[PDB]
Design a protein around this ligand. Structure first.
Ligand SMILES: CCCCCCCCCCCCCCCCCC(=O)OC[C@H](CO[C@@H]1O[C@H](CO[C@H]2O[C@H](CO)[C@H](O)[C@H](O)[C@H]2O)[C@H](O)[C@H](O)[C@H]1O)OC(=O)CCCCCCCCCCCCCCCCC
Ligand code: CLA
Ligand code: CLA
Ligand code: CLA
Ligand code: CLA
Ligand SMILES: CCCCCCCCCCCCCCCC(=O)OC[C@H](COP(=O)(O)OC[C@@H](O)CO)OC(=O)CCCCCCCCCCCCCCC
Ligand SMILES: CCCCCCCCCCCCCCCC(=O)OC[C@H](COP(=O)(O)OC[C@@H](O)CO)OC(=O)CCCCCCCCCCCCCCC
Ligand SMILES: CCCCCCCCCCCCCCCC(=O)OC[C@H](COP(=O)(O)OC[C@@H](O)CO)OC(=O)CCCCCCCCCCCCCCC
Ligand SMILES: CC1=C(/C=C/C(C)=C/C=C/C(C)=C/C=C/C=C(C)/C=C/C=C(C)/C=C/C2=C(C)CCCC2(C)C)C(C)(C)CCC1
Ligand SMILES: CC1=C(/C=C/C(C)=C/C=C/C(C)=C/C=C/C=C(C)/C=C/C=C(C)/C=C/C2=C(C)CCCC2(C)C)C(C)(C)CCC1
Ligand SMILES: CC1=C(/C=C/C(C)=C/C=C/C(C)=C/C=C/C=C(C)/C=C/C=C(C)/C=C/C2=C(C)CCCC2(C)C)C(C)(C)CCC1
Ligand SMILES: CC1=C(/C=C/C(C)=C/C=C/C(C)=C/C=C/C=C(C)/C=C/C=C(C)/C=C/C2=C(C)CCCC2(C)C)C(C)(C)CCC1
Ligand SMILES: [Cl-]
Ligand SMILES: [Cl-]
Ligand SMILES: [Fe+2]
Ligand code: NA
Lengths: 336, 348, 31, 30, 37, 76, 449, 36, 33
């Protein structure tokens, strides 16, 4: 082929003979993701405490500073920074950069770039292999949620300090404070997201059980049935008609989904759509829209307030609200 | 049956009738499923429509009181009734249907009829699978929702002081139950809800990934831009390329399935295991064996007044939830806490 | 007619319409 | 010493992932 | 509010904005009329 | 079993049901309006939540004799 | 109409049957444009009918009336509504024009030629005639440039627009001397999008806005002419896919980016979205609360300058990481907020201690209190305040509605870029319907990836 | 049984269902449960 | 008997037997048509 080095480089980058597919989206995914992985690992293992709330009250999140895996995290950037860009070269010294929560911002930025390029790379390999290019559309839902909880919510709230901490207990803290300040449980989009994950579990179990049951006898006893299927079988090893008949008889006849294609499109579209909706809900609440507020909505003839389960939810929300950041509030209304 | 069929008995006539393939398969399991499930759903609807919780939780939880679909709920009975089964003929209601509604007996009615309906539905799955000669993997999968229902609505309330702490059948009531678990049991920190979360999220991931991968590796099989028409239910060849999907995911992700049976077994396996682990954790909570704290970190924080982690902040949040929800969530305690004892931050 | 499907339809239809009427009437109550 | 154990466990998990990716058994067609 | 000449026509204005969401439902009705041909 | 399309497009079905579906709807409206719903299901009316002496939410606080307790706590 | 048998597209993709039917495609696009204008007119009439000029616009949930008011048209000093008639005129005009456009869409969709290539060569594109597509792009680009110059003319010689930075409470000012400097105007686009910089969202002057729209209008007209008189370069031919769905995907990506930008503009910017009509922003409300409590505790004796908070950092005033004096508390995250009611109190090194003692004017206090009580926090059912409220106030800020809605739209149109773009690539290559099943590419590759 | 076409029945039933839903929302904003 | 709760329990047993026999008789009658 072309003797030029650039043509050889382009051939190698776009080659489908690589064990892992590099691509043009790959040449941005690899460095950003590797940088994020390196910083996250070194920060999670040994990183000094971070003044997340900007009140000069550092929070320890690394293993070396007395944390386990469950409590350890990469603490978000200092509230004093806000949405300001905080690269390493901006800080006076590495000590200051570590103190103000720079590693969180570095990891979040390089990681957002990485996941966007990962979606692009999924499309690119689909195009290179001659297949339909919509796996990336399905993958957009996790990307949407990650952007909402790492980028969009900090932007709406005006500080990276409100982004989800890169840890487990940090994740739980983020969830609890989010419920306190937005009543996410009553928001119809977390409702759709819950319906989506529950439906994903239900439909995954249902589809897997139906396909496993309909699996035609190609392997007898004394060994696992997986030996009956071959990677190059190029045939359906399961009786689809029996599975459809079972599913129809289970609830009611003419339950549709006699198409394998229709069934798999439904499997693809239910959780993806619901995760899209819940990510949009997180972003809209990032712009302070909140869920339903039916507090004191029921009153008697004379005007006395009749409490509802929404009122008990509000009591729990009040409990979370007055404790989430003990020392960071100087004025009665949070508003931030 | 085996050596010979002997003579036809009335059981044979009943079996032949019940096993007919009509629009709604009743079967032998139907005699338990249809009445129980029908009464459970109808009781939930009547309770969310007309029955109130003013005497049980001191809360208005019906449509006729002004509640909507979100806030209406068939509330659990009063705590003073303990774990009473609350039969409409029992020593509590003593036959008064209206007062039985008022005492909260509808919750016990709905819960018991729903439990027997779930038993009947798994029996229905077994019966239908046996009729069509299929390995009953879907009943085995449905064992997980039954485990969740048993551990949450039956085992957990029995471990506590009464039905009062069970989940009331409703939307906002379930949300209250969830927040109560976070505040009191620290349920998020429990590794079993962690495994359940992992199982459910992985099941959703598998559902989405399998659907997308199948829909994006389809063989052509047709000339229309609508790929759904290019499929026959009775065809033998696979409608999507397994080799192409395996290669794609091997080069994108690193590992990929190469066995359809194993793939679908994994799809069945992940959510069931997640739900079963969550059920075991809920049993532990029923006994109040909660994974509430890491004692090492609490001791270090007590000795070191400047050591702080997200775990300690979560503990403070739980403390706030408990203190501010106890007074109205548990009226039987009669907690008249003055505002000066409630934990509270600064200027909030 | 009065088949099994008839009963299955009417067990979830007559109560449904009755309750829809009840809820509609509730919508026009003044405290 | 707990940090050492946690680091070892994480390193072991990552090494298992690496081996399962780059030293997998080849998918045998037919 | 509207100028005093157009005050009686207030109900029509209060009803107008929902027509655009009626157009998509009309498209679905039209498709159903042809058996989703 | 006749297909649902044939039944739903049959004039006989509609002439049969056009006097029964409204009858059920009107029955439900009458059930709510005539005060029967409160009478049978025991939900207190908007002017019956609080009595002369009970100015707060009621509490059952008894296992047996709960019938008498809920009867004296409920509107008389 | 059409059917699936003759087209290959089911009903749920029926408009895809219009890809190669130029006349009916024109009819559909004209009908949707008529729909847009109809919503504009009808919603404007709805808003004016439900409008009481005594209350502020943002109190009553109006989104279009603030848009009209920002262009002048019946607002006095301080954003006081004088005449509601211009709003009515705008509603009626957009509505009647929508009726005309709807008739046109109906005609070009039902009776007009199905394909315009034969009878009307001037309108007969082929989705791959690059010169014709560039010509259409040039025409509509010229139209957009004319619209931008229309805005410039409105601000220059037709009464000006509502400057919220005018001395006092803001007023309708005639912008003279627009910022026509290349460095200033193009410094916004290369500006960072992070805090303190904000990319183009941080445009603060009316002069900058008018100069920018001047540059954009001139460039759009020039680019329209250029794309009219030229064919894409040979490198441009290889880089892009040339099909109708490809062009749709490019436009989808562009408008998704624009939707995200509009969401951020509505949430953060208060120059092009004056707070007199849209209400305070998030940062504006937080700064207003801090300012109100500062003046309250300063009136009750005390010395806010030396007042130390519980954290030892400053209860009312502190120092930004750069060193600028800023309001204390959580609102330190919004230290880069700039507003008409707070700029007079800022010295060279930030908030001035002396000015904060005696230079505060009562109108600033009233505006700060009003903004504090109307912070952009609400519920889905329009219940004002934080999630833990008493369900007594009926208010959600128009900024919140605009931000949430147009962010959702931007995200969905990014998903549109993904979908329609991938499909364009596959259809151009030939994979749109599936694997070949006779020559799979994968079967021609060496094993083990 | 070709009289009363199925699409007409579906449209009428859908209109009734949407009207019922709108009545429910209206009742959400007035009377009991309206927070006033 | 001695206790009212016991009498209610026995009557509940009788009523449950009645409904169970009703279900069995219904299925028998429909099976024999
Ligand atoms: C990656 C990081 C993205 C950060 C971002 O971009 O998000 C923020 C920016 C907007 O930046 C904000 O811009 C603001 C501009 O307002 C300033 O200027 C205004 C002018 O009226 C007012 O004076 C206001 O008071 C004053 O604060 C401030 O500078 C904020 O600090 C700054 O965060 O969005 C934007 O640029 C628009 C781009 C949004 C991208 C959304 C991506 C979704 C996927
Ligand atoms: C699928 C059929 C079925 C099943 C499994 C149940 C099961 C149950 N019902 Mg129920 N019920 C049914 C049908 C059914 N019901 C029908 C058709 C009606 C309408 C009349 C009712 C109306 C009803 C009411 C009003 C109540 C129940 C209640 C209960 C629960 C208490 C059990 C009990 O003590 O009853 C009786 C015990 C037995 C029948 C034991 C069996 C003895 C056999 C049949 C005969 C032996 C006696 C012989 C003389 C010696 C229980 C889980 C109670 C409840 O909800 O608790 C809160 C309650 O109050 N049911
Ligand atoms: C605003 C959205 C919009 C628009 C502008 C169009 C436009 C169009 N569609 Mg389409 N469609 C849409 C949404 C839309 N669609 C949606 C949401 C779906 C999913 C259900 C479809 C599914 C679909 C299919 C399956 C098909 C089309 C087709 C068509 C084209 C032919 C129309 C025709 O002749 O039908 C017939 C016209 C009538 C039956 C007349 C009744 C409707 C008219 C327009 C009355 C409008 C009322 C209005 C108030 C009149 C105002 C008058 C004015 C003077 C004030 C046309 C250009 C067809 C096509 O592909 O073209 C070849 C086709 O087969 N569409
Ligand atoms: C993007 C807007 C747009 C475009 C590109 C066209 C383009 C076209 N129109 Mg149309 N039209 C439009 C909007 C538009 N129209 C609107 C808004 C209306 C309502 C006033 C009409 C009403 C209309 C009529 C009545 C006719 C056309 C006709 C035509 C064709 C004749 C060319 C010409 O003489 O000019 C042409 C392809 C003529 C035609 O279709 O030829 C048969 C014709 O009779 N148009
Ligand atoms: C939305 C209107 C529009 C559209 C759709 C197009 C579309 C097109 N133009 Mg055109 N152009 C326009 C407006 C437009 N132009 C205007 C207003 C002008 C006057 C300045 C020009 C002047 C122009 C010239 C001179 C040329 C084109 C060319 C082209 C074709 C090649 C596109 C390309 O180079 O790829 C993509 C472009 C790039 C990868 C380079 C990016 C350059 C910009 C300035 C980067 C700025 C980045 C900056 C930091 C802002 C970032 C913020 C951002 C994220 C929002 C293409 C079909 C070429 C052509 O084919 O000739 C006919 C060509 O030579 N255009
Ligand atoms: C419905 C209407 C409710 C009537 C309300 C009601 O029942 O009142 C309860 C009824 C009331 O009797 P009393 O106790 O009031 O009569 C004596 C009084 O003077 C002293 O209390 O007690 C019974 O007779 C036994 C209840 C059996 C009847 C209930 C269910 C009947 C069949 C269902 C059996 C359970 C289901 C499982 C079957 C397998
Ligand atoms: C807001 C939500 C409304 C739009 C949601 C976007 C739907 C994106 C599909 C999610 C599934 C992920 C890929 C899974 C996937 O690739 O699906 C496979 C399937 C591909 O079908 P076909 O390509 O044969 O459909 C005909 C046309 O799409 C021709 O390209 O997608 C659809 O069926 C789209 C149906 C239209 C939906 C109308 C709404
Ligand atoms: C470019 C991005 C690179 C990063 C991707 C990382 C890939 C992870 C692959 C590891 C899989 C491990 C199982 C090996 C075993 C293995 O994969 O064998 C390969 C197997 C395919 O085998 P077969 O299809 O032949 O299975 C049938 C057998 O029963 C015998 O026929 O794939 C799977 O089982 C499902 C894929 C794993 C599903 C994802 C695993 C999720 C675990 C994530 C662990 C998180 C740890 C966090 C760090 C603390
Ligand atoms: C408890 C009890 C009982 C039982 C009873 C029953 C069983 C009842 C039934 C009931 C029922 C059975 C009811 C029903 C209900 C229903 C309803 C109430 C409806 C609902 C629906 C709706 C609300 C709708 C919605 C919507 C619309 C509107 C639009 C579109 C979409 C949809 C469709 C979703 C007895 C006798 C044992 C005795 C003792 C006590
Ligand atoms: C194609 C087609 C489509 C679409 C269509 C369309 C969308 C069209 C357009 C339409 C339109 C969009 C039209 C418009 C209309 C409007 C009008 C016609 C107006 C009128 C006005 C008047 C009559 C007056 C009024 C008034 C005044 C001015 C003053 C104030 C008061 C008032 C308001 C009363 C569809 C989907 C169906 C599908 C199929 C095909
Ligand atoms: C008006 C105004 C202003 C101004 C503004 C401006 C100055 C604008 C312009 C802007 C601009 C100046 C824009 C541009 C953009 C561009 C872009 C966005 C591009 C993109 C690219 C692409 C899309 C491509 C891609 C690719 C590659 C790279 C590779 C191969 C393939 C392709 C070619 C496809 C201111 C600020 C004062 C504010 C106020 C208003
Ligand atoms: C401006 C104005 C006007 C107006 C105009 C117009 C433009 C109108 C429109 C009209 C329309 C445009 C209407 C439409 C409507 C629609 C509808 C009414 C629909 C419904 C539907 C439903 C309810 C359902 C459906 C369904 C689906 C969704 C699926 C499939 C199946 C079915 C079909 C069932 C007038 C005259 C007043 C005068 C004054 C001024
Ligand atoms: Cl926190
Ligand atoms: Cl504060
Ligand atoms: Fe499958
Ligand atoms: Na606090």
């Amino acid at each position: 082929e072309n003797t030029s080095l650039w043509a050889r480089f382009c051939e190698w980058i776009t080659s489908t003979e690589n064990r892992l597919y590099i691509g043009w989206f790959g040449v941005i995914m690899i460095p950003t993701l590797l940088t994020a992985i390196s910083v996250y690992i070194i920060a999670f293992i040994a990183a000094p405490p971070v003044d997340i709330d900007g009140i000069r009250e550092p929070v320890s999140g690394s293993l070396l500073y007395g944390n386990n895996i469950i409590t350890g995290a990469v603490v978000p950037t200092s509230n004093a920074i806000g949405l300001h860009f905080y690269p390493i070269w901006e800080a006076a010294s590495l000590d200051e950069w570590l103190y103000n929560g720079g590693p969180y911002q570095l990891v979040v930025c390089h990681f957002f770039l990485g996941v966007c390029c990962y979606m692009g790379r999924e499309w690119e390999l689909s195009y290179r292999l001659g297949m339909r290019p919509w796996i990336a559309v399905a993958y957009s839902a996790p990307v949407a949620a990650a952007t909402a909880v790492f980028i969009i919510y900090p932007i709406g709230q005006g500080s990276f300090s409100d982004g989800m901490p890169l840890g487990i207990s940090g994740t739980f803290n983020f969830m609890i404070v989010f419920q306190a300040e937005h009543n996410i449980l009553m928001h119809p989009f977390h409702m759709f997201g819950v319906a989506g994950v529950f439906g994903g579990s239900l439909f995954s179990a249902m589809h897997g059980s139906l396909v496993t049951s309909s699996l035609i006898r190609e392997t007898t006893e004394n060994e696992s049935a997986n030996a009956g299927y071959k990677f190059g079988q190029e045939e359906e090893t399961y009786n689809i008609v029996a599975a459809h008949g079972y599913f129809g008889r289970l609830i009611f006849q003419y339950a549709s989904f006699n198409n394998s294609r229709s069934l798999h499109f439904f499997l693809a579209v239910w959780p993806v759509v619901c995760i899209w909706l819940t990510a949009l809900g997180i972003s809209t609440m990032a712009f302070n829209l909140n869920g339903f507020n039916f507090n004191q909505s029921v009153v008697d003839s004379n005007g006395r307030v009749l409490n509802t389960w929404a009122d008990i939810i509000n009591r729990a929300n009040l409990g979370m609200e007055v404790m989430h950041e003990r020392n960071a509030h100087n004025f009665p209304l949070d508003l931030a | 049956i085996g050596t010979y069929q002997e003579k036809r008995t009335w059981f044979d006539d009943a079996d032949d009738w019940l096993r007919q393939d009509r629009f709604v398969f009743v079967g032998w399991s139907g005699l338990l499923l249809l009445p129980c499930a029908y009464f459970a759903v109808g009781g939930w609807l009547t309770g969310c429509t007309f029955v109130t919780s003013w005497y049980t939780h001191g809360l208005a939880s019906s449509y006729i009181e002004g509640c909507n679909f979100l806030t209406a709920a068939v509330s659990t009975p009063a705590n003073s009734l303990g774990h009473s089964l609350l039969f409409v003929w029992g020593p509590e209601a003593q036959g008064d249907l209206t007062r039985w509604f008022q005492l909260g007996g509808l919750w016990a009615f709905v819960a018991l009829h729903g439990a027997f309906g779930l038993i009947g539905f798994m029996l229905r799955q077994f019966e239908i699978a046996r009729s069509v000669n299929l390995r009953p993997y879907n009943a085995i999968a449905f064992s997980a929702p039954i485990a969740v229902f048993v551990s949450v609505f039956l085992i957990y309330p029995l471990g506590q002081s009464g039905w009062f702490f069970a989940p009331s059948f409703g939307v906002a009531s379930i949300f209250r139950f969830i927040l109560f678990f976070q505040g009191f049991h620290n349920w998020t920190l429990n590794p079993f809800h962690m495994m359940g979360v992992a199982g459910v999220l992985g099941a959703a991931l598998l559902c989405a990934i399998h659907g997308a991968t199948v829909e994006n590796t389809l063989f052509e099989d047709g000339d229309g831009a609508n790929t759904f028409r290019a499929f026959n239910p009775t065809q033998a060849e696979e409608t999507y390329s397994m080799v192409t999907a395996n290669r794609f995911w091997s080069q994108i992700f690193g590992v990929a399935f190469s066995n359809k049976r194993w793939l679908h077994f994994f799809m069945l396996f992940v959510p069931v295991t997640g739900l079963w682990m969550s059920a075991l954790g809920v049993v532990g909570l029923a006994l109040n064996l909660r994974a509430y704290d890491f004692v090492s970190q609490e001791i270090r924080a007590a000795e070191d007044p400047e050591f702080e982690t997200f775990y300690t902040k979560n503990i403070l949040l739980n403390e706030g939830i408990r203190a501010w929800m106890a007074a109205q969530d548990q009226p039987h305690e009669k907690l008249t806490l003055p505002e000066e004892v409630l934990p509270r931050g600064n200027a909030l | 007619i009065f088949t099994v499907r008839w009963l299955a339809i009417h067990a979830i239809a007559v109560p449904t319409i009755f309750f829809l009427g009840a809820i509609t009437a509730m919508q026009f109550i003044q405290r | 010493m707990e940090a050492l154990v946690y680091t070892f466990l994480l390193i072991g998990t990552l090494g298992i992932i690496f081996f399962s990716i780059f030293f997998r058994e080849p998918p045998r067609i037919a | 509010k509207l100028p005093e000449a157009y005050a009686p026509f207030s109900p029509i204005v209060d009803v107008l904005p929902i027509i655009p969401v009626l157009f998509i439902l009309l498209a679905f009705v039209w498709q159903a009329s042809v058996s989703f041909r | 079993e006749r297909p649902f399309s044939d039944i739903l497009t049959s004039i006989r079905y509609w002439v049969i049901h056009s006097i029964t579906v409204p009858s059920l709807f009107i029955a439900g409206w009458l059930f709510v309006s005539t005060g029967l719903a409160y009478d049978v299901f025991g939900s207190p009316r908007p002017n019956e939540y609080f009595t002369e002496d009970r100015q707060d939410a009621p509490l059952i606080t008894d296992r047996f004799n709960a019938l008498e307790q809920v009867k004296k706590l409920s509107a008389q | 109409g059409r059917d699936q048998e003759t087209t290959g597209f089911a009903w749920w993709a029926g408009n895809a049957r219009l890809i190669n039917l130029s006349g009916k495609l024109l009819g559909a696009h004209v009908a949707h444009a008529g729909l847009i204008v109809f919503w504009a007119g009808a919603m404007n009439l709805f808003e004016v009918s439900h409008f009481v000029p005594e209350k502020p616009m943002y109190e009553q949930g109006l989104i279009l009336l603030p848009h009209i008011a920002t262009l002048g048209y019946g607002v006095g000093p301080g954003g006081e509504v004088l005449d509601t008639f211009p709003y009515f005129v705008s509603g009626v005009l957009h509505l009647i024009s929508s009726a005309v456009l709807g008739f046109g869409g109906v005609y070009h969709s039902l009776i007009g030629p199905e394909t315009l290539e034969e009878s009307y060569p001037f309108f007969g594109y082929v989705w791959k005639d690059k010169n014709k597509m560039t010509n259409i792009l040039g025409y509509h680009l010229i139209i957009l440039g004319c619209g931008a110059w229309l805005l410039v003319l409105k601000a220059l010689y037709f009464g000006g627009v509502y400057d919220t930075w005018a001395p006092g409470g803001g007023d309708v000012r005639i912008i003279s001397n627009p910022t026509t400097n290349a460095a200033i105007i193009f410094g916004y686009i290369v500006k960072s999008p992070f805090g303190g910089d904000g990319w183009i969202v941080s445009v603060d002057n009316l002069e900058d806005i008018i100069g920018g729209h001047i540059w954009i209008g001139t460039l759009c007209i020039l680019g329209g002419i250029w794309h009219i008189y030229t064919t894409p370069w040979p490198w441009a031919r290889r880089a892009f896919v040339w099909s109708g769905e490809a062009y749709l995907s490019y436009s989808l990506a562009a408008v998704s980016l624009m939707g995200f930008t509009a969401c951020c503009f509505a949430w953060f910017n208060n120059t092009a979205y004056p707070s007199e009509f849209y209400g305070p922003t998030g940062p504006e409300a937080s700064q207003a609360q801090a300012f109100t409590f500062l003046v309250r505790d300063q009136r009750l004796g005390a010395n806010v300058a030396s007042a130390q908070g519980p954290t030892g950092l400053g209860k009312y005033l502190m120092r930004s990481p750069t060193g600028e004096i800023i309001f204390g508390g959580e609102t330190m995250r919004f230290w880069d907020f700039r507003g008409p009611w707070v700029e007079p109190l800022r010295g060279p090194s930030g908030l001035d201690l002396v000015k904060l003692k005696n230079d505060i004017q009562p109108w600033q206090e009233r505006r700060a209190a009003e903004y504090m009580t109307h912070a952009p926090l609400g519920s889905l059912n329009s219940v004002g305040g934080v999630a833990t409220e008493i369900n007594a106030v009926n208010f959600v800020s128009p900024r919140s509605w605009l931000a949430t809605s147009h962010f959702c739209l931007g995200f969905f149109f990014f998903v549109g870029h993904l979908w329609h773009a991938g499909r364009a690539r596959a259809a151009a290559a030939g994979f749109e319907k599936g694997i070949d099943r006779v020559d799979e590419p994968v079967l021609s590759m060496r094993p083990l990836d | 049984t070709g009289r009363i076409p199925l699409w007409l029945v579906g449209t009428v039933v859908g209109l009734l269902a949407i009207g019922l839903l709108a009545i429910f929302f209206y009742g959400s904003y007035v009377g009991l449960g309206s927070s006033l | 008997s001695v206790t009212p709760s016991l009498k209610n329990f026995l009557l509940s047993l009788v009523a449950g037997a009645v409904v169970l026999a009703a279900i069995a008789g219904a299925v028998t009658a429909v099976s024999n048509f």
